[PDB]
Design a protein around this ligand. Structure first.
Ligand code: CLA
Ligand code: CLA
Ligand code: CLA
Ligand code: CLA
Ligand code: CLA
Ligand code: CLA
Ligand code: CLA
Ligand code: CLA
Ligand code: LMG
Ligand code: PQN
Ligand code: SF4
Lengths: 172, 645, 49, 48, 185, 92, 127, 70
């Protein structure tokens, strides 16, 4: 009759800030109501940035702990001490500089989408490529991106936690 | 929207041509925190308080960060006798001489009293301090922009506020600190004093550690628990537990149904609460300054003399400043209230109270400084037996030399604290009393002559801060309660400067006396303070000129920074003299000539150059005077006590 | 609405319309809106030369 | 386009000569094993 | 008449009126002989927070039921693993001060309870009425009709209160005695 | 202790080159400020700095020594004494 | 009394609390309380809540209202109105005879005697 | 706004009916134009200029200690 409920948390009404977004029509999981207090566009931007970063980080850890190593004597360090040896070596600051450039332009994207100067969607950066033309295909692809991002966030969290606890490669 | 309103004060400043002057900028700064009476005044006050709490949390996080990364805290743990340094100085310009700066804030002793043994713990505390500061900033934002009006907290919900502060904040904080002491600050100090390594602090909360290793509840433990660095923590834990119990019990056994702020407006109620709170905080700061060297509470604290001196002097200065601000805000609340009929008895005994205090101040000043000048004259005339000293006319403080009472199972503090007083102590204590009385005279006069006076009869129409009423009636400059606080700040500076001089000379005299050797047991007088602090010449020679050798011969040494700050403090203090002695009109005419020079070259600034207003000039002069004097004393004390101790 | 050809996630910068290299309309920060385009083009050409 | 390319290229040449501490053309000398870590202090050099 | 939660939330919030009944018509008095409208102190007079009181009572009863069961069962069978064996932790009350800290299990349980309680905090504050109270939409085997629903609600309430009191005297009966499931001396 | 030779000879530790460098830098500063005030004849733009225009003036004041002298000799630098607020209260 | 102070639910404010608020508020102050007065917030919550008006409110708004409204005892108890009446009678009397306090330990301690501070001959004489 | 709330408030009106599933973003409604205007203030702009000048002097002193090229 009313108060469209969260399909994930069935005892809490879905936050109206979730309407029109990818993960709302099937999950709608906002129990703490962050979207009620924070701008849902910013939250989606943060979620997708985290998901993409974690999806890169998970495969990076997989490669580094499987023996995939760049051809250099300085690069022959384990993943645990990788982000101390590479910090001292220099490339960590280099990656920081380039990601800082990319993130400054991402800041421009965010501070242009909020004022309406662009019709840019939160996670959108313009990379269509493997993007369906049909709207249903676009929605399903965005849902796949979000689910993979969340899964890899949790996966990388577990990977780093278990690797620090018990120093091993990855299957543990 | 909100960003637009962030510079809203500047937009209003430029909107009207009347506010396109530098005086408008100075007013914008002076009226920054002067939250005007409105429906959201209480929200503004509470949010500002929470923002200040966040700022203090930033400061604490920075201090713990310096302890973690830029301090020799571990080396100090291994050897408390070494110099505690917690501020690295990079090699820029030529400042490399002072690279390790001996910090005298007592953070090392505090952290040792907290059971902190690893710099990782300091890193964690710094991170949590940053988190707490972020939370405080979030809460301050929220309260300013989205929360309750808070207008009921001082009149309607004052019972709830007071009861919460009594039970929850104070009592529960004391109880939690007692638990922290008993559980991780006592055992860690035990295992450090015994040198038997320290486990993780959480492992002490195991119910299998010394908590149940032995159930004996007195001074008896493994091997020989005879550490006297540890007993002050035991006493502190007992004190906190007892204080929590008495606070919790008395809060529910107290009336608290008496709010004296019913008759005051919300703004005046806030100002009066701020005044009484400042009075309490200032007297608490002074009490702590006395008790820091009166009673040992931190591990290896008394051994670190620069830390003791710095704690005493800093807390004395803060107490004096807050005591002055107490009367400042009492005056603000009285003069800004529509019907402040509550102070009717004191506003009707205005002249009686003021004149009796005037006689008290006159009597104390003539007597104390006449004892000093009489000693100076007699010593100059070669009449040491006519002076006021132990070997002469003796002004023995008899009222000090008695605390005997029925025992009833007590000890220690049942006496004069094991210290004998002499004529010099009597005279300097009377000097302290006179200076305190004069500061109180100025502040009380500002409070009483705030709404009206025999000279100007409508001073309440002039608000709290005004330059004057005019050159009429012979001259009415400095009649405002603000100007009375302005003069009381100078007299507080004088009082606290004499107090810290007395403390520092007594401390150095005691250090020299205990450096008898061991065999030397007739200190006669010696006691350089007791023998020489009876003349103004005695002070000028054996304290100021004598101890200035450390601060003026500090060039090329790590105390060269203290020497440079000594010079800069003198410079700022003479600049204050510039601001205080001069007047606004002259500088306005000078600026007129300079502005003609500008206009001649088509420069023509539109924010018209105006010299500082009369009150602004007085405030700048007072700020520079306090900065210069306090900085001179700071550099002098720190150089003297670090080089020689 | 209109977006820059080079940076699809940013608005199309104005003042780049009639210019030699303006068809790619690359100006994320947007010095076009702040400064004279003639001076910016002169500076770019001089730097390149 | 040539101007932009040469601006970036000249910056690269200068900083290559900085990192290698040598001539531009003998790129990545024998036994390179990466550039030497940068000298002079920083906020992270004093354990920031 | 369970009033499916989606339409039940239409009357949520802090109700300011008074139903005129006992504690806002809550199920639970429902004693053996008649109705035991207990409320001796008078917390039910504070009518606006009566749904809050029901939520607190239901949460306490559920946590109790689980805790009494979870200090009865382990005295018979333990989880496979050396850290939970009958020799490593001789008594169930020792299980608290046996793992804790950096052993993992108890901290994980606390973490997950905190997460599930923070996620369901929007149910307690806001979205909480007289009818909803403790309804977390876990009905499933909640019988239909109306009197059957009342009987199951009163069964839950009586069992929860009984388990609260039982757990109290159980942790008490185990600290003063240190014995298996029958905690008699 | 090494000395500074302020005679005017171009020597090691002299004053002519530091004097020229400072004078150029501060003429740059003053001309940038004066240009901003001339192109922003408004107290609003004084309290609220027009950052593009301010930096335009700052980077454009590099030619101060020659532009200033051209304005001085062409009458656009100084102001006629009869057109500015000059002190004549004595009724001169 | 005023129409909006009629049949106010106990949830918004207690009956004793409402009576105390009215007792401590001047009669002419009603019908238009100042923004910073307790009666103004009590009025604002008196409408939009009760009888045919909105009978429910969100939990955060309930917390707001509870923070912004008195709770009868210890805040608007009859003893508090008695003390306020005593204080106003005191201030009325001091225009005349003044109670005698003495500052003991720096705090004025009431003695129990009331002075004749009013001059015998010249009312406005300062001596 | 019958409930007395401060100017520039992100607070919903506390006079609401039964629990509302509404979106009330507690974040300051700032503006990019407004932020740029604020950072262009004379205090902000000139303190940033002073910081830039001071840091430039710091770096010149670091990489060219003393006046070695006098
Ligand atoms: C950086 C972490 C992060 C962030 C910012 C978000 C942000 C978001 N998630 Mg999300 N999510 C994440 C990690 C994250 N997610 C992970 C790891 C999982 C796997 C369990 C999920 C699973 C998930 C589901 C199943 C759903 C969301 C949804 C949402 C959106 C609404 C929730 C909200 O109000 O904010 C949440 C704010 C945070 C998580 C901040 C972190 C707070 C911690 C203390 C929002 C855009 C909903 C959606 O699609 O809305 C349209 C939705 O249905 N998320
Ligand atoms: C979140 C993303 C992320 C991050 C932070 C890192 C971080 C790191 N990687 Mg890594 N990596 C990643 C993704 C990531 N990786 C992915 C997706 C791959 C698969 C192509 C790899 C393959 C990889 C190899 C083969 C090696 C590293 C190495 C390293 C370390 C030095 C940096 C370097 O040379 O990278 C090099 C990264 C690449 C050449 C590929 C990155 C390109 C994708 C698009 C990102 C550093 C700890 C080196 C090291 O020292 O390990 C100890 C090393 O030998 N990584
Ligand atoms: C309580 C306030 C406070 C104060 C007075 C200081 C004061 C100082 N800090 Mg500091 N700091 C603080 C809080 C504070 N900090 C906090 C909260 C943190 C944690 C983020 C730090 C983290 C920190 C680091 C990591 C370093 C300092 C350093 C310094 C010193 C030089 C600062 C500098 O180079 O300027 C630079 C200012 C800017 C670049 C402007 C922005 C100086 C004594 C440095 C030092 O001691 O060098 C040896 C240093 O490396 N601080
Ligand atoms: C709990 C402490 C506290 C609080 C909350 C307040 C709050 C207030 N005071 Mg107050 N005051 C206090 C303590 C306090 N005071 C004390 C202790 C004194 C005695 C010294 C005073 C003396 C005082 C006077 C005389 C006046 C106020 C006024 C005010 C009001 C406006 C303040 C303002 O706009 O300043 C804005 C902030 C500043 C001006 C800060 C500028 C920096 C100061 C001037 C010097 C700091 C120098 C610094 C320490 C050294 C620099 C470092 C060095 C190394 C270079 C406000 C209600 C004014 C008023 O009208 O009240 C209604 C007023 O006229 N106060
Ligand atoms: C105000 C502080 C002060 C005090 C207490 C003294 C005290 C003294 N000075 Mg001295 N002196 C002072 C300042 C002071 N000096 C200063 C500033 C100078 C520099 C000019 C000097 C220069 C000086 C010289 C050059 C000499 C002294 C000498 C003396 C001694 C004798 C003075 C004398 O004849 O008494 C006179 C006293 C009185 C006339 C009585 C006045 C006090 C009465 C008792 C007040 C009573 C009030 C009463 C209780 C009110 C209530 C009444 C009501 C109940 C009815 C005496 C110890 C002489 C000496 O060598 O002796 C050791 C001496 O030759 N003084
Ligand atoms: C035109 C002036 C100027 C120049 C040429 C430099 C140049 C440099 N600075 Mg520097 N700096 C400047 C102004 C300048 N800065 C200002 C105004 C500040 C703040 C007061 C700083 C604060 C600063 C710090 C704290 C550090 C540097 C560092 C460095 C060096 C590495 C580059 C870097 O980290 O960026 C510096 C970053 C900024 C200027 C951005 C600030 C926002 C580099 C030589 C780093 C270094 O020595 O690494 C080896 C370093 O740790 N600088
Ligand atoms: C309030 C609820 C509650 C709480 C806080 C605990 C807490 C605990 N239980 Mg436990 N338990 C509970 C209910 C609860 N239990 C119930 C209802 C049962 C019956 C199935 C059990 C059966 C049980 C066994 C058999 C064992 C524990 C054990 C433990 C301890 C280690 C954690 C563990 O492995 O649990 C394991 C818990 C489960 C497998 C069942 C959880 C079901 C949830 C409540 C739904 C820990 C103190 C272990 C221990 O050290 O002995 C005391 C152990 O061997 N519990
Ligand atoms: C309602 C359930 C219930 C039941 C059946 C019992 C039953 C019993 N209790 Mg008991 N008890 C209960 C609740 C209950 N208690 C509660 C709620 C408390 C307070 C936490 C206690 C506190 C308690 C103590 C302190 C003692 C008992 C003891 C006893 C035994 C005698 C008996 C088996 C005694 C015992 O252990 O056996 C002699 C005993 O000393 N009980
Ligand atoms: C979020 C990721 C966290 C980043 C870690 C903190 C950053 C840090 O420590 O900075 C550390 C790095 C430098 O880091 C230092 O670099 C030195 C190089 O001389 C050393 O070789 C090491 O890399 C490291 O000590 O600082 C920066 O690069 C910060 C500026 C990044 C600017 C990006 C914007 C680009 C435009
Ligand atoms: C000098 C003076 C002025 C003139 C003061 C003015 C015009 C204030 C402007 C001074 C500027 C703002 C100084 C800026 C700071 C200095 C450059 C020093 C700080 C920075 C250095 C340490 C590098 C008064 O207006 C005045 C008014 C009433 C009584 C006495 C006086 C008074 O003595
Ligand atoms: S000198 Fe200054 S403060 Fe004194 S009366 Fe004249 S104008 Fe007022």
């Amino acid at each position: 009759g009313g108060y469209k409920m969260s399909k994930a948390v069935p005892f809490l009404p879905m936050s109206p800030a979730l309407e029109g977004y990818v993960g709302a029509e099937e999950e709608g999981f906002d129990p703490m109501g962050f979207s009620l207090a924070l701008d849902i566009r910013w939250l989606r931007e943060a979620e997708l940035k985290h998901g993409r970063i974690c999806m890169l980080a998970t495969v990076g850890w997989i490669a580094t702990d499987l023996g995939m190593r760049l051809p250099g004597p300085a690069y022959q360090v384990s993943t645990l001490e990788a982000h101390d040896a590479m910090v001292k070596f220099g490339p960590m600051a280099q990656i920081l500089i380039w990601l800082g450039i990319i993130e400054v332009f991402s800041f421009l994207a965010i501070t242009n989408m909020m004022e309406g100067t662009t019709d840019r969607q939160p996670g959108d950066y313009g990379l269509r490529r493997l993007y369906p033309k049909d709207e249903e295909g676009q929605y399903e692809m965005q849902l796949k991106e979000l689910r993979n991002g969340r899964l890899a966030m949790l996966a990388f969290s577990g990977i780093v936690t278990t690797a620090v606890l018990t120093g091993r490669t990855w299957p543990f | 929207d909100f960003s637009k309103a962030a510079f809203g004060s500047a937009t209003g400043l430029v909107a009207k041509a009347a506010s396109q002057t530098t005086t408008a900028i100075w007013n914008l700064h002076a009226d920054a925190h002067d939250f005007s009476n409105s429906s959201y005044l209480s929200k503004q006050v509470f949010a500002a308080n929470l923002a200040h709490i966040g700022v203090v949390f930033i400061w604490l996080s920075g201090m713990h960060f310096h302890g973690a990364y830029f301090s020799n805290y571990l080396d100090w743990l291994q050897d408390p006798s070494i110099a505690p340094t917690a501020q690295q100085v990079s090699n820029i310009a030529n400042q490399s001489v002072l690279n390790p700066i001996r910090v005298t804030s007592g953070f090392f002793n505090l952290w040792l009293a907290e059971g902190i043994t690893s710099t990782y713990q300091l890193k964690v505390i710094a991170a949590f301090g940053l988190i707490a500061s972020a939370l405080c900033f979030l809460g301050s934002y929220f309260h300013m922009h989205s929360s309750t009006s808070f207008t009921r907290v001082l009149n309607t919900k004052l019972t709830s506020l007071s009861t919460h502060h009594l039970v929850g904040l104070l009592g529960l904080g004391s109880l939690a600190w007692a638990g922290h002491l008993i559980h991780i600050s006592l055992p860690v100090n035990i295992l450090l004093n015994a040198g038997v390594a320290v486990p993780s602090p959480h492992s002490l909360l195991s119910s299998k550690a010394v908590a149940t290793i032995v159930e004996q509840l007195s001074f008896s433990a493994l091997t020989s628990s005879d550490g006297y660095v540890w007993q002050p923590l035991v006493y502190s834990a007992m004190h906190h537990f007892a204080l929590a119990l008495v606070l919790i019990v008395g809060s529910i056994f107290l009336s608290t149904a008496s709010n004296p702020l019913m008759s005051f407006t919300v703004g005046s109620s806030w100002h009066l609460v701020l005044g009484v709170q400042l009075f309490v905080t200032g007297t608490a700061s002074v009490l702590y300054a006395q008790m820091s060297n009166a009673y040992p509470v931190y591990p290896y604290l008394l051994t670190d003399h620069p830390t003791v001196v710095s704690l005493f002097v800093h807390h004395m200065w803060i107490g004096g400043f807050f005591l002055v601000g107490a009367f400042a805000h009492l005056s603000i609340g009285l003069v800004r209230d529509t019907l402040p009929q509550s102070f009717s008895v004191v506003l009707t005994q205005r002249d009686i109270i003021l004149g009796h205090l005037t006689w008290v101040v006159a009597f104390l000043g003539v007597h104390s400084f006449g004892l000093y000048v009489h000693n100076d004259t007699m010593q100059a005339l070669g009449r040491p037996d006519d002076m006021f000293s132990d070997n002469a006319i003796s002004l023995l403080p008899v009222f000090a030399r008695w605390s005997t009472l029925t025992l009833n199972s007590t000890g220690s503090a049942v006496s004069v604290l094991g210290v004998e007083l002499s004529t010099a102590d009597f005279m300097v204590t009377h000097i302290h009393a006179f200076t305190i009385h004069t500061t109180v005279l100025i502040l009380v006069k500002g409070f009483l002559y705030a709404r009206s006076s025999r000279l100007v009869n409508d001073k309440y129409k002039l608000d709290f801060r005004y330059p004057c009423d005019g050159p009429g009636r012979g001259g009415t400059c400095q009649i405002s309660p603000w100007d009375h606080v302005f003069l009381g700040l100078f007299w507080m500076y004088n009082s606290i400067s004499v107090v810290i001089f007395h403390f520092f000379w007594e401390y150095q005299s005691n250090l020299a006396s205990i450096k008898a050797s061991a065999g030397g047991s007739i200190r006669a007088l010696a006691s350089d303070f007791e023998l020489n602090s009876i003349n103004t010449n005695g002070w000028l020679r054996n304290f100021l000129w004598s101890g200035a050798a450390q601060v003026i011969q500090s060039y090329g040494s790590p105390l060269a920074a203290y020497g440079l700050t000594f010079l800069a403090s003198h410079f700022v203090w003479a600049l204050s003299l510039m601001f205080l002695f001069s007047g606004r009109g002259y500088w306005q005419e000078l600026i007129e000539s300079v502005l003609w020079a500008h206009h001649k070259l088509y420069v023509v600034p539109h924010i018209q150059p105006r010299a500082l207003s009369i009150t602004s000039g007085r405030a700048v002069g007072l700020t520079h005077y306090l900065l210069g004097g306090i900085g001179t004393t700071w550099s002098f004390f720190l150089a003297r006590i670090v080089a020689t101790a | 609405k209109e977006t820059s050809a080079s940076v699809p996630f940013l608005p199309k910068p104005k003042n780049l319309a009639g210019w030699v290299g303006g068809e790619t309309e690359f100006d994320p920060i947007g010095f076009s809106n702040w400064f004279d385009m003639k001076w910016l083009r002169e500076a770019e050409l001089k730097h390149g030369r | 386009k040539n101007g932009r390319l040469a601006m970036l290229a000249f910056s690269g040449m200068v900083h290559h000569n900085i990192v290698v501490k040598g001539a531009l053309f003998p790129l990545v000398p024998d036994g390179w094993t990466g550039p030497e870590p940068w000298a002079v202090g920083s906020i992270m050099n004093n354990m920031g | 008449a369970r009033r499916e939660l989606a339409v039940a939330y239409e009357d949520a919030g802090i109700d300011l009126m008074d139903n005129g009944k006992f504690a806002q018509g809550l199920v639970g008095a429902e004693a053996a002989f008649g109705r035991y409208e207990f409320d001796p102190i008078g917390f039910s007079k504070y009518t606006e927070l009566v749904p809050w009181f029901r939520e607190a009572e239901l949460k306490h009863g559920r946590i109790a039921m689980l805790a009494w069961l979870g200090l009865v069962v382990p005295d018979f069978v333990r989880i496979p693993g050396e850290a939970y064996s009958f020799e490593a932790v001789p008594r169930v009350i020792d299980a608290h001060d046996a793992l804790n800290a950096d052993a993992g299990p108890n901290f994980q349980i606390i973490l997950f309870i905190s997460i599930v309680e923070l996620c369901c905090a929007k149910k307690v504050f806001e979205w909480n009425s007289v009818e909803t109270a403790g309804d977390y939409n876990l009905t499933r085997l909640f019988p239909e009709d109306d009197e059957a629903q009342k009987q199951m609600r009163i069964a839950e309430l009586k069992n929860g209160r009984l388990a609260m009191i039982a757990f109290g005297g159980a942790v008490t009966q185990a600290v003063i005695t240190g014995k298996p499931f029958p905690w008699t001396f | 202790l090494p000395r500074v030779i302020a005679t005017g000879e171009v020597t090691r530790g002299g004053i002519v080159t530091p004097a020229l460098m400072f004078l150029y830098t501060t003429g740059w500063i003053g001309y940038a400020g004066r240009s901003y005030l001339l192109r922003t004849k408004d107290a609003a733009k004084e309290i609220k700095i027009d950052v593009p225009l301010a930096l335009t003036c700052m980077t454009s004041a590099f030619a101060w020594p020659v532009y200033s002298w051209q304005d001085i000799t062409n009458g656009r630098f100084v102001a006629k004494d009869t057109e500015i607020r000059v002190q004549r209260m004595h009724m001169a | 009394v005023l129409p909006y102070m009629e049949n106010i639910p106990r949830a918004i404010v207690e009956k004793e609390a409402l009576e105390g608020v009215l007792a401590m508020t001047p009669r002419e102050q009603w019908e238009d309380p100042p923004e910073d007065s307790v009666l103004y917030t009590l009025k604002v919550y008196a409408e939009t809540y009760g009888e045919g008006k909105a009978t429910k409110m969100p939990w955060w708004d309930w917390l707001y209202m509870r923070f912004e409204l008195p709770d009868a005892n210890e805040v608007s108890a009859e003893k508090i109105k008695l003390m306020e009446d005593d204080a106003k009678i005191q201030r009325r009397m001091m225009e005349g005879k003044i109670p005698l306090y003495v500052p003991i330990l720096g705090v004025p301690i009431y003695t129990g005697m009331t002075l004749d501070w009013k001059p015998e001959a010249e009312l406005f004489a300062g001596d | 706004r019958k409930i007395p709330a401060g100017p520039y408030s992100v607070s919903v009106e506390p006079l609401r009916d039964g629990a509302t599933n509404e979106v009330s973003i507690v974040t300051p409604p700032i503006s990019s134009e407004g932020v740029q205007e604020y950072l262009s203030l004379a205090p902000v702009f000139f303190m940033a200029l002073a910081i830039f000048t001071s840091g430039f002097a710091i770096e010149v002193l670091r990489f060219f200690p003393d006046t070695r090229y006098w």
